[PDB]
Amino acid sequence: PEVRAERYIPAPPERVYRLAKDLEGLKPYLKEVESLEVVAREGARTRSRWVAVAMGKKVRWLEEEEWDDENLRNRFFSPEGDFDRYEGTWVFLPEGEGTRVVLTLTYELTIPIFGGLLRKLVQKLMQENVESLLKGLEERVLAASS
């Protein structure tokens, strides 16, 4: 299944893009994220270790992001961790002197026994998570803007 969040940020795309790329600087404004560490940095891609909290227990994964500096987009995919699949794109679109940020996330989480019964709740949780990742980026861009 897939989730997508969309958010307008009052700042030029290039600036919003660059602030999202500095994940470790972004991390303090992601309230649902407990730990985010960049483990590897290479050319236009990094590797990072996420620990997030949903509903009191933690979900952990490693994430590879490929950064497209030219076109202000990124692609990410988890090769290992708690998700069978965790991937998507951040894109930063011009909307005025500002940025329409679009975050798309395809995930698959296998849950013993209850995976179909709680499919919609899981969905909503993943919706809140990406909406919050974006509201947290809003708050980064404002913080770094003073």
mmCIF file with all atom_site columns, N, CA and C in Angstrom, residues 21-92:
data_model
loop_
_atom_site.group_PDB
_atom_site.id
_atom_site.type_symbol
_atom_site.label_atom_id
_atom_site.label_alt_id
_atom_site.label_comp_id
_atom_site.label_asym_id
_atom_site.label_entity_id
_atom_site.label_seq_id
_atom_site.pdbx_PDB_ins_code
_atom_site.Cartn_x
_atom_site.Cartn_y
_atom_site.Cartn_z
_atom_site.occupancy
_atom_site.B_iso_or_equiv
_atom_site.pdbx_formal_charge
_atom_site.auth_seq_id
_atom_site.auth_comp_id
_atom_site.auth_asym_id
_atom_site.auth_atom_id
_atom_site.pdbx_PDB_model_num
ATOM 1   N N  . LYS A 1 21 ? 17.633 17.589 2.939   1.00 0.00 ? 21 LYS A N  1
ATOM 2   C CA . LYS A 1 21 ? 18.730 16.690 2.614   1.00 0.00 ? 21 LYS A CA 1
ATOM 3   C C  . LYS A 1 21 ? 19.655 16.513 3.806   1.00 0.00 ? 21 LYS A C  1
ATOM 4   N N  . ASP A 1 22 ? 19.740 17.544 4.638   1.00 0.00 ? 22 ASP A N  1
ATOM 5   C CA . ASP A 1 22 ? 20.491 17.469 5.884   1.00 0.00 ? 22 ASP A CA 1
ATOM 6   C C  . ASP A 1 22 ? 19.605 16.808 6.920   1.00 0.00 ? 22 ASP A C  1
ATOM 7   N N  . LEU A 1 23 ? 19.507 15.482 6.821   1.00 0.00 ? 23 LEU A N  1
ATOM 8   C CA . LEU A 1 23 ? 18.576 14.713 7.633   1.00 0.00 ? 23 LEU A CA 1
ATOM 9   C C  . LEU A 1 23 ? 18.848 14.916 9.118   1.00 0.00 ? 23 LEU A C  1
ATOM 10  N N  . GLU A 1 24 ? 20.119 14.995 9.483   1.00 0.00 ? 24 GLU A N  1
ATOM 11  C CA . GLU A 1 24 ? 20.447 15.072 10.887  1.00 0.00 ? 24 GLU A CA 1
ATOM 12  C C  . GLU A 1 24 ? 20.045 16.424 11.464  1.00 0.00 ? 24 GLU A C  1
ATOM 13  N N  . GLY A 1 25 ? 20.131 17.473 10.646  1.00 0.00 ? 25 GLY A N  1
ATOM 14  C CA . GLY A 1 25 ? 19.614 18.764 11.047  1.00 0.00 ? 25 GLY A CA 1
ATOM 15  C C  . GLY A 1 25 ? 18.095 18.790 11.071  1.00 0.00 ? 25 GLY A C  1
ATOM 16  N N  . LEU A 1 26 ? 17.473 17.909 10.297  1.00 0.00 ? 26 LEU A N  1
ATOM 17  C CA . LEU A 1 26 ? 16.017 17.852 10.219  1.00 0.00 ? 26 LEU A CA 1
ATOM 18  C C  . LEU A 1 26 ? 15.475 17.102 11.432  1.00 0.00 ? 26 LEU A C  1
ATOM 19  N N  . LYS A 1 27 ? 16.263 16.156 11.933  1.00 0.00 ? 27 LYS A N  1
ATOM 20  C CA . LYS A 1 27 ? 15.761 15.177 12.889  1.00 0.00 ? 27 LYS A CA 1
ATOM 21  C C  . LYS A 1 27 ? 15.071 15.758 14.136  1.00 0.00 ? 27 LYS A C  1
ATOM 22  N N  . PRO A 1 28 ? 15.625 16.836 14.730  1.00 0.00 ? 28 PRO A N  1
ATOM 23  C CA . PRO A 1 28 ? 14.997 17.417 15.929  1.00 0.00 ? 28 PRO A CA 1
ATOM 24  C C  . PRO A 1 28 ? 13.560 17.907 15.767  1.00 0.00 ? 28 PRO A C  1
ATOM 25  N N  . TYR A 1 29 ? 13.119 18.121 14.533  1.00 0.00 ? 29 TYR A N  1
ATOM 26  C CA . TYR A 1 29 ? 11.769 18.626 14.275  1.00 0.00 ? 29 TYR A CA 1
ATOM 27  C C  . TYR A 1 29 ? 10.811 17.512 13.853  1.00 0.00 ? 29 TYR A C  1
ATOM 28  N N  . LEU A 1 30 ? 11.314 16.276 13.834  1.00 0.00 ? 30 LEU A N  1
ATOM 29  C CA . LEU A 1 30 ? 10.495 15.096 13.554  1.00 0.00 ? 30 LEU A CA 1
ATOM 30  C C  . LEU A 1 30 ? 10.097 14.398 14.863  1.00 0.00 ? 30 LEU A C  1
ATOM 31  N N  . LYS A 1 31 ? 8.911  14.726 15.354  1.00 0.00 ? 31 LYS A N  1
ATOM 32  C CA . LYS A 1 31 ? 8.544  14.367 16.711  1.00 0.00 ? 31 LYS A CA 1
ATOM 33  C C  . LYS A 1 31 ? 8.296  12.878 16.861  1.00 0.00 ? 31 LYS A C  1
ATOM 34  N N  . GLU A 1 32 ? 8.015  12.197 15.758  1.00 0.00 ? 32 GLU A N  1
ATOM 35  C CA . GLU A 1 32 ? 7.723  10.771 15.811  1.00 0.00 ? 32 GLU A CA 1
ATOM 36  C C  . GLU A 1 32 ? 8.988  9.949  15.588  1.00 0.00 ? 32 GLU A C  1
ATOM 37  N N  . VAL A 1 33 ? 10.094 10.643 15.322  1.00 0.00 ? 33 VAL A N  1
ATOM 38  C CA . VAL A 1 33 ? 11.384 9.995  15.131  1.00 0.00 ? 33 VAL A CA 1
ATOM 39  C C  . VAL A 1 33 ? 12.216 10.121 16.392  1.00 0.00 ? 33 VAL A C  1
ATOM 40  N N  . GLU A 1 34 ? 12.707 8.984  16.878  1.00 0.00 ? 34 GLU A N  1
ATOM 41  C CA . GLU A 1 34 ? 13.503 8.925  18.096  1.00 0.00 ? 34 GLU A CA 1
ATOM 42  C C  . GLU A 1 34 ? 14.992 9.053  17.779  1.00 0.00 ? 34 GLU A C  1
ATOM 43  N N  . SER A 1 35 ? 15.424 8.410  16.701  1.00 0.00 ? 35 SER A N  1
ATOM 44  C CA . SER A 1 35 ? 16.819 8.479  16.276  1.00 0.00 ? 35 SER A CA 1
ATOM 45  C C  . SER A 1 35 ? 16.944 8.422  14.751  1.00 0.00 ? 35 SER A C  1
ATOM 46  N N  . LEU A 1 36 ? 17.770 9.301  14.199  1.00 0.00 ? 36 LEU A N  1
ATOM 47  C CA . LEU A 1 36 ? 18.044 9.284  12.775  1.00 0.00 ? 36 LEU A CA 1
ATOM 48  C C  . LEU A 1 36 ? 19.523 9.588  12.567  1.00 0.00 ? 36 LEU A C  1
ATOM 49  N N  . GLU A 1 37 ? 20.279 8.566  12.189  1.00 0.00 ? 37 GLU A N  1
ATOM 50  C CA . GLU A 1 37 ? 21.716 8.716  12.010  1.00 0.00 ? 37 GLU A CA 1
ATOM 51  C C  . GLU A 1 37 ? 22.167 8.405  10.580  1.00 0.00 ? 37 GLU A C  1
ATOM 52  N N  . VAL A 1 38 ? 22.850 9.363  9.960   1.00 0.00 ? 38 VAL A N  1
ATOM 53  C CA . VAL A 1 38 ? 23.445 9.136  8.647   1.00 0.00 ? 38 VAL A CA 1
ATOM 54  C C  . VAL A 1 38 ? 24.659 8.223  8.800   1.00 0.00 ? 38 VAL A C  1
ATOM 55  N N  . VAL A 1 39 ? 24.577 7.013  8.247   1.00 0.00 ? 39 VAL A N  1
ATOM 56  C CA . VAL A 1 39 ? 25.653 6.046  8.410   1.00 0.00 ? 39 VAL A CA 1
ATOM 57  C C  . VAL A 1 39 ? 26.685 6.095  7.278   1.00 0.00 ? 39 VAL A C  1
ATOM 58  N N  . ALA A 1 40 ? 26.262 6.508  6.084   1.00 0.00 ? 40 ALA A N  1
ATOM 59  C CA . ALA A 1 40 ? 27.157 6.581  4.929   1.00 0.00 ? 40 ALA A CA 1
ATOM 60  C C  . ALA A 1 40 ? 26.775 7.731  4.001   1.00 0.00 ? 40 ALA A C  1
ATOM 61  N N  . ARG A 1 41 ? 27.781 8.417  3.465   1.00 0.00 ? 41 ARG A N  1
ATOM 62  C CA . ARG A 1 41 ? 27.565 9.541  2.548   1.00 0.00 ? 41 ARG A CA 1
ATOM 63  C C  . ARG A 1 41 ? 28.474 9.322  1.337   1.00 0.00 ? 41 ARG A C  1
ATOM 64  N N  . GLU A 1 42 ? 27.894 9.301  0.138   1.00 0.00 ? 42 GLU A N  1
ATOM 65  C CA . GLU A 1 42 ? 28.627 8.923  -1.078  1.00 0.00 ? 42 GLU A CA 1
ATOM 66  C C  . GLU A 1 42 ? 27.980 9.579  -2.291  1.00 0.00 ? 42 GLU A C  1
ATOM 67  N N  . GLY A 1 43 ? 28.767 10.291 -3.091  1.00 0.00 ? 43 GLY A N  1
ATOM 68  C CA . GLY A 1 43 ? 28.192 10.968 -4.238  1.00 0.00 ? 43 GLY A CA 1
ATOM 69  C C  . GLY A 1 43 ? 26.879 11.636 -3.866  1.00 0.00 ? 43 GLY A C  1
ATOM 70  N N  . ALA A 1 44 ? 25.815 11.271 -4.569  1.00 0.00 ? 44 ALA A N  1
ATOM 71  C CA . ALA A 1 44 ? 24.516 11.901 -4.371  1.00 0.00 ? 44 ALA A CA 1
ATOM 72  C C  . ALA A 1 44 ? 23.595 11.056 -3.503  1.00 0.00 ? 44 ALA A C  1
ATOM 73  N N  . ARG A 1 45 ? 24.126 9.998  -2.901  1.00 0.00 ? 45 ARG A N  1
ATOM 74  C CA . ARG A 1 45 ? 23.316 9.143  -2.032  1.00 0.00 ? 45 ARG A CA 1
ATOM 75  C C  . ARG A 1 45 ? 23.876 9.025  -0.618  1.00 0.00 ? 45 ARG A C  1
ATOM 76  N N  . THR A 1 46 ? 22.978 8.885  0.352   1.00 0.00 ? 46 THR A N  1
ATOM 77  C CA . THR A 1 46 ? 23.377 8.571  1.714   1.00 0.00 ? 46 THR A CA 1
ATOM 78  C C  . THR A 1 46 ? 22.707 7.288  2.134   1.00 0.00 ? 46 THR A C  1
ATOM 79  N N  . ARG A 1 47 ? 23.155 6.757  3.269   1.00 0.00 ? 47 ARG A N  1
ATOM 80  C CA . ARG A 1 47 ? 22.461 5.682  3.958   1.00 0.00 ? 47 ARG A CA 1
ATOM 81  C C  . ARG A 1 47 ? 22.217 6.146  5.388   1.00 0.00 ? 47 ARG A C  1
ATOM 82  N N  . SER A 1 48 ? 21.027 5.875  5.908   1.00 0.00 ? 48 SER A N  1
ATOM 83  C CA . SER A 1 48 ? 20.672 6.369  7.228   1.00 0.00 ? 48 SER A CA 1
ATOM 84  C C  . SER A 1 48 ? 19.893 5.331  8.031   1.00 0.00 ? 48 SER A C  1
ATOM 85  N N  . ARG A 1 49 ? 20.036 5.388  9.352   1.00 0.00 ? 49 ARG A N  1
ATOM 86  C CA . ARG A 1 49 ? 19.361 4.457  10.253  1.00 0.00 ? 49 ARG A CA 1
ATOM 87  C C  . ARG A 1 49 ? 18.251 5.188  11.008  1.00 0.00 ? 49 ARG A C  1
ATOM 88  N N  . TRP A 1 50 ? 17.012 4.773  10.783  1.00 0.00 ? 50 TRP A N  1
ATOM 89  C CA . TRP A 1 50 ? 15.871 5.412  11.426  1.00 0.00 ? 50 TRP A CA 1
ATOM 90  C C  . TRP A 1 50 ? 15.334 4.549  12.573  1.00 0.00 ? 50 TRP A C  1
ATOM 91  N N  . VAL A 1 51 ? 14.962 5.206  13.665  1.00 0.00 ? 51 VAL A N  1
ATOM 92  C CA . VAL A 1 51 ? 14.075 4.606  14.642  1.00 0.00 ? 51 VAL A CA 1
ATOM 93  C C  . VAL A 1 51 ? 12.907 5.541  14.863  1.00 0.00 ? 51 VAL A C  1
ATOM 94  N N  . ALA A 1 52 ? 11.708 5.039  14.599  1.00 0.00 ? 52 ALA A N  1
ATOM 95  C CA . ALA A 1 52 ? 10.495 5.821  14.757  1.00 0.00 ? 52 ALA A CA 1
ATOM 96  C C  . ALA A 1 52 ? 9.615  5.165  15.807  1.00 0.00 ? 52 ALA A C  1
ATOM 97  N N  . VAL A 1 53 ? 8.733  5.957  16.402  1.00 0.00 ? 53 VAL A N  1
ATOM 98  C CA . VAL A 1 53 ? 7.757  5.395  17.312  1.00 0.00 ? 53 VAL A CA 1
ATOM 99  C C  . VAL A 1 53 ? 6.353  5.570  16.773  1.00 0.00 ? 53 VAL A C  1
ATOM 100 N N  . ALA A 1 54 ? 5.610  4.476  16.767  1.00 0.00 ? 54 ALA A N  1
ATOM 101 C CA . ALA A 1 54 ? 4.184  4.513  16.517  1.00 0.00 ? 54 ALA A CA 1
ATOM 102 C C  . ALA A 1 54 ? 3.519  3.648  17.583  1.00 0.00 ? 54 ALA A C  1
ATOM 103 N N  . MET A 1 55 ? 2.613  4.239  18.353  1.00 0.00 ? 55 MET A N  1
ATOM 104 C CA . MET A 1 55 ? 1.832  3.479  19.328  1.00 0.00 ? 55 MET A CA 1
ATOM 105 C C  . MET A 1 55 ? 2.686  2.852  20.426  1.00 0.00 ? 55 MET A C  1
ATOM 106 N N  . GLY A 1 56 ? 3.745  3.545  20.827  1.00 0.00 ? 56 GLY A N  1
ATOM 107 C CA . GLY A 1 56 ? 4.491  3.113  21.995  1.00 0.00 ? 56 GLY A CA 1
ATOM 108 C C  . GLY A 1 56 ? 5.630  2.136  21.741  1.00 0.00 ? 56 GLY A C  1
ATOM 109 N N  . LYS A 1 57 ? 5.521  1.317  20.695  1.00 0.00 ? 57 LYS A N  1
ATOM 110 C CA . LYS A 1 57 ? 6.647  0.471  20.312  1.00 0.00 ? 57 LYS A CA 1
ATOM 111 C C  . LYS A 1 57 ? 7.363  1.028  19.092  1.00 0.00 ? 57 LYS A C  1
ATOM 112 N N  . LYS A 1 58 ? 8.649  0.718  18.984  1.00 0.00 ? 58 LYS A N  1
ATOM 113 C CA . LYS A 1 58 ? 9.479  1.349  17.981  1.00 0.00 ? 58 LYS A CA 1
ATOM 114 C C  . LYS A 1 58 ? 9.617  0.511  16.714  1.00 0.00 ? 58 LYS A C  1
ATOM 115 N N  . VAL A 1 59 ? 9.764  1.207  15.595  1.00 0.00 ? 59 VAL A N  1
ATOM 116 C CA . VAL A 1 59 ? 9.979  0.581  14.308  1.00 0.00 ? 59 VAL A CA 1
ATOM 117 C C  . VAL A 1 59 ? 11.315 1.084  13.776  1.00 0.00 ? 59 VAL A C  1
ATOM 118 N N  . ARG A 1 60 ? 12.180 0.161  13.352  1.00 0.00 ? 60 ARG A N  1
ATOM 119 C CA . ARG A 1 60 ? 13.564 0.471  13.010  1.00 0.00 ? 60 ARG A CA 1
ATOM 120 C C  . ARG A 1 60 ? 13.855 0.039  11.575  1.00 0.00 ? 60 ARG A C  1
ATOM 121 N N  . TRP A 1 61 ? 14.500 0.905  10.804  1.00 0.00 ? 61 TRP A N  1
ATOM 122 C CA . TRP A 1 61 ? 14.940 0.491  9.486   1.00 0.00 ? 61 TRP A CA 1
ATOM 123 C C  . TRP A 1 61 ? 16.181 1.243  9.031   1.00 0.00 ? 61 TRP A C  1
ATOM 124 N N  . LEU A 1 62 ? 16.880 0.661  8.064   1.00 0.00 ? 62 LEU A N  1
ATOM 125 C CA . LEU A 1 62 ? 17.929 1.372  7.365   1.00 0.00 ? 62 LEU A CA 1
ATOM 126 C C  . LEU A 1 62 ? 17.344 1.880  6.056   1.00 0.00 ? 62 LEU A C  1
ATOM 127 N N  . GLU A 1 63 ? 17.802 3.044  5.611   1.00 0.00 ? 63 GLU A N  1
ATOM 128 C CA . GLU A 1 63 ? 17.217 3.697  4.451   1.00 0.00 ? 63 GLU A CA 1
ATOM 129 C C  . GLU A 1 63 ? 18.310 4.223  3.545   1.00 0.00 ? 63 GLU A C  1
ATOM 130 N N  . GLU A 1 64 ? 18.170 3.956  2.258   1.00 0.00 ? 64 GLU A N  1
ATOM 131 C CA . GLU A 1 64 ? 19.068 4.513  1.266   1.00 0.00 ? 64 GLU A CA 1
ATOM 132 C C  . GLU A 1 64 ? 18.312 5.611  0.517   1.00 0.00 ? 64 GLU A C  1
ATOM 133 N N  . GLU A 1 65 ? 18.877 6.810  0.502   1.00 0.00 ? 65 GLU A N  1
ATOM 134 C CA . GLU A 1 65 ? 18.309 7.876  -0.307  1.00 0.00 ? 65 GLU A CA 1
ATOM 135 C C  . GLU A 1 65 ? 19.265 8.340  -1.395  1.00 0.00 ? 65 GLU A C  1
ATOM 136 N N  . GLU A 1 66 ? 18.717 8.493  -2.594  1.00 0.00 ? 66 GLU A N  1
ATOM 137 C CA . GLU A 1 66 ? 19.453 9.013  -3.730  1.00 0.00 ? 66 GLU A CA 1
ATOM 138 C C  . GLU A 1 66 ? 18.948 10.428 -3.945  1.00 0.00 ? 66 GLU A C  1
ATOM 139 N N  . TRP A 1 67 ? 19.885 11.376 -3.929  1.00 0.00 ? 67 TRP A N  1
ATOM 140 C CA . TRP A 1 67 ? 19.569 12.794 -3.994  1.00 0.00 ? 67 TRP A CA 1
ATOM 141 C C  . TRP A 1 67 ? 19.820 13.326 -5.399  1.00 0.00 ? 67 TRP A C  1
ATOM 142 N N  . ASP A 1 68 ? 18.806 13.966 -5.969  1.00 0.00 ? 68 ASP A N  1
ATOM 143 C CA . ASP A 1 68 ? 18.932 14.583 -7.267  1.00 0.00 ? 68 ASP A CA 1
ATOM 144 C C  . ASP A 1 68 ? 19.005 16.112 -7.132  1.00 0.00 ? 68 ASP A C  1
ATOM 145 N N  . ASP A 1 69 ? 20.223 16.620 -6.973  1.00 0.00 ? 69 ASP A N  1
ATOM 146 C CA . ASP A 1 69 ? 20.458 18.039 -6.727  1.00 0.00 ? 69 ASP A CA 1
ATOM 147 C C  . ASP A 1 69 ? 19.961 18.894 -7.883  1.00 0.00 ? 69 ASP A C  1
ATOM 148 N N  . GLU A 1 70 ? 20.165 18.421 -9.104  1.00 0.00 ? 70 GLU A N  1
ATOM 149 C CA . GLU A 1 70 ? 19.738 19.155 -10.294 1.00 0.00 ? 70 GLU A CA 1
ATOM 150 C C  . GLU A 1 70 ? 18.250 19.481 -10.285 1.00 0.00 ? 70 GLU A C  1
ATOM 151 N N  . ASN A 1 71 ? 17.427 18.458 -10.084 1.00 0.00 ? 71 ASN A N  1
ATOM 152 C CA . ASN A 1 71 ? 15.986 18.607 -10.217 1.00 0.00 ? 71 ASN A CA 1
ATOM 153 C C  . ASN A 1 71 ? 15.243 18.679 -8.885  1.00 0.00 ? 71 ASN A C  1
ATOM 154 N N  . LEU A 1 72 ? 15.983 18.811 -7.787  1.00 0.00 ? 72 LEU A N  1
ATOM 155 C CA . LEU A 1 72 ? 15.378 18.963 -6.458  1.00 0.00 ? 72 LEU A CA 1
ATOM 156 C C  . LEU A 1 72 ? 14.396 17.844 -6.114  1.00 0.00 ? 72 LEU A C  1
ATOM 157 N N  . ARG A 1 73 ? 14.830 16.601 -6.325  1.00 0.00 ? 73 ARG A N  1
ATOM 158 C CA . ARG A 1 73 ? 14.050 15.413 -5.978  1.00 0.00 ? 73 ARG A CA 1
ATOM 159 C C  . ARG A 1 73 ? 14.965 14.414 -5.273  1.00 0.00 ? 73 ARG A C  1
ATOM 160 N N  . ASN A 1 74 ? 14.357 13.470 -4.567  1.00 0.00 ? 74 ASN A N  1
ATOM 161 C CA . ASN A 1 74 ? 15.090 12.383 -3.952  1.00 0.00 ? 74 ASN A CA 1
ATOM 162 C C  . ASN A 1 74 ? 14.307 11.084 -4.131  1.00 0.00 ? 74 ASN A C  1
ATOM 163 N N  . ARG A 1 75 ? 15.011 9.960  -4.136  1.00 0.00 ? 75 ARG A N  1
ATOM 164 C CA . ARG A 1 75 ? 14.377 8.648  -4.082  1.00 0.00 ? 75 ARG A CA 1
ATOM 165 C C  . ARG A 1 75 ? 14.975 7.867  -2.914  1.00 0.00 ? 75 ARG A C  1
ATOM 166 N N  . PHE A 1 76 ? 14.144 7.116  -2.197  1.00 0.00 ? 76 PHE A N  1
ATOM 167 C CA . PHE A 1 76 ? 14.634 6.336  -1.067  1.00 0.00 ? 76 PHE A CA 1
ATOM 168 C C  . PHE A 1 76 ? 14.041 4.938  -1.025  1.00 0.00 ? 76 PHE A C  1
ATOM 169 N N  . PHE A 1 77 ? 14.764 4.014  -0.405  1.00 0.00 ? 77 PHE A N  1
ATOM 170 C CA . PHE A 1 77 ? 14.353 2.619  -0.363  1.00 0.00 ? 77 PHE A CA 1
ATOM 171 C C  . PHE A 1 77 ? 15.021 2.007  0.866   1.00 0.00 ? 77 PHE A C  1
ATOM 172 N N  . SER A 1 78 ? 14.310 1.140  1.584   1.00 0.00 ? 78 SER A N  1
ATOM 173 C CA . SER A 1 78 ? 14.902 0.425  2.715   1.00 0.00 ? 78 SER A CA 1
ATOM 174 C C  . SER A 1 78 ? 15.304 -0.980 2.303   1.00 0.00 ? 78 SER A C  1
ATOM 175 N N  . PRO A 1 79 ? 16.605 -1.292 2.384   1.00 0.00 ? 79 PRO A N  1
ATOM 176 C CA . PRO A 1 79 ? 17.134 -2.611 2.019   1.00 0.00 ? 79 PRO A CA 1
ATOM 177 C C  . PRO A 1 79 ? 17.041 -3.591 3.192   1.00 0.00 ? 79 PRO A C  1
ATOM 178 N N  . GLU A 1 80 ? 16.899 -3.041 4.393   1.00 0.00 ? 80 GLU A N  1
ATOM 179 C CA . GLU A 1 80 ? 16.742 -3.865 5.579   1.00 0.00 ? 80 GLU A CA 1
ATOM 180 C C  . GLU A 1 80 ? 16.111 -3.105 6.746   1.00 0.00 ? 80 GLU A C  1
ATOM 181 N N  . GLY A 1 81 ? 15.509 -3.862 7.658   1.00 0.00 ? 81 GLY A N  1
ATOM 182 C CA . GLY A 1 81 ? 14.840 -3.256 8.785   1.00 0.00 ? 81 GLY A CA 1
ATOM 183 C C  . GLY A 1 81 ? 13.534 -3.956 9.031   1.00 0.00 ? 81 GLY A C  1
ATOM 184 N N  . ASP A 1 82 ? 12.607 -3.260 9.671   1.00 0.00 ? 82 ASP A N  1
ATOM 185 C CA . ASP A 1 82 ? 11.332 -3.854 10.069  1.00 0.00 ? 82 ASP A CA 1
ATOM 186 C C  . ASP A 1 82 ? 10.288 -3.933 8.946   1.00 0.00 ? 82 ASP A C  1
ATOM 187 N N  . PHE A 1 83 ? 10.397 -3.058 7.959   1.00 0.00 ? 83 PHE A N  1
ATOM 188 C CA . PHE A 1 83 ? 9.492  -3.097 6.811   1.00 0.00 ? 83 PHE A CA 1
ATOM 189 C C  . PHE A 1 83 ? 9.997  -4.102 5.767   1.00 0.00 ? 83 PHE A C  1
ATOM 190 N N  . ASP A 1 84 ? 9.080  -4.810 5.125   1.00 0.00 ? 84 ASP A N  1
ATOM 191 C CA . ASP A 1 84 ? 9.440  -5.601 3.961   1.00 0.00 ? 84 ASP A CA 1
ATOM 192 C C  . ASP A 1 84 ? 9.712  -4.655 2.821   1.00 0.00 ? 84 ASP A C  1
ATOM 193 N N  . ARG A 1 85 ? 9.012  -3.532 2.839   1.00 0.00 ? 85 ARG A N  1
ATOM 194 C CA . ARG A 1 85 ? 9.179  -2.525 1.812   1.00 0.00 ? 85 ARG A CA 1
ATOM 195 C C  . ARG A 1 85 ? 8.956  -1.147 2.420   1.00 0.00 ? 85 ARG A C  1
ATOM 196 N N  . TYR A 1 86 ? 9.872  -0.229 2.126   1.00 0.00 ? 86 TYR A N  1
ATOM 197 C CA . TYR A 1 86 ? 9.746  1.145  2.568   1.00 0.00 ? 86 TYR A CA 1
ATOM 198 C C  . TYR A 1 86 ? 10.476 2.058  1.595   1.00 0.00 ? 86 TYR A C  1
ATOM 199 N N  . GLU A 1 87 ? 9.713  2.698  0.717   1.00 0.00 ? 87 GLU A N  1
ATOM 200 C CA . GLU A 1 87 ? 10.303 3.415  -0.399  1.00 0.00 ? 87 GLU A CA 1
ATOM 201 C C  . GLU A 1 87 ? 9.384  4.513  -0.929  1.00 0.00 ? 87 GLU A C  1
ATOM 202 N N  . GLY A 1 88 ? 9.980  5.457  -1.651  1.00 0.00 ? 88 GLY A N  1
ATOM 203 C CA . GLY A 1 88 ? 9.194  6.550  -2.167  1.00 0.00 ? 88 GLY A CA 1
ATOM 204 C C  . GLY A 1 88 ? 10.033 7.701  -2.671  1.00 0.00 ? 88 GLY A C  1
ATOM 205 N N  . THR A 1 89 ? 9.440  8.877  -2.714  1.00 0.00 ? 89 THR A N  1
ATOM 206 C CA . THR A 1 89 ? 10.143 10.024 -3.247  1.00 0.00 ? 89 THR A CA 1
ATOM 207 C C  . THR A 1 89 ? 9.775  11.239 -2.424  1.00 0.00 ? 89 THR A C  1
ATOM 208 N N  . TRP A 1 90 ? 10.734 12.145 -2.266  1.00 0.00 ? 90 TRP A N  1
ATOM 209 C CA . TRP A 1 90 ? 10.459 13.530 -1.888  1.00 0.00 ? 90 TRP A CA 1
ATOM 210 C C  . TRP A 1 90 ? 10.684 14.392 -3.143  1.00 0.00 ? 90 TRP A C  1
ATOM 211 N N  . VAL A 1 91 ? 9.692  15.192 -3.512  1.00 0.00 ? 91 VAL A N  1
ATOM 212 C CA . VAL A 1 91 ? 9.876  16.144 -4.603  1.00 0.00 ? 91 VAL A CA 1
ATOM 213 C C  . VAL A 1 91 ? 9.494  17.550 -4.157  1.00 0.00 ? 91 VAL A C  1
ATOM 214 N N  . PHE A 1 92 ? 10.197 18.534 -4.702  1.00 0.00 ? 92 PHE A N  1
ATOM 215 C CA . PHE A 1 92 ? 10.049 19.901 -4.252  1.00 0.00 ? 92 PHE A CA 1
ATOM 216 C C  . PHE A 1 92 ? 9.695  20.760 -5.448  1.00 0.00 ? 92 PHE A C  1
#
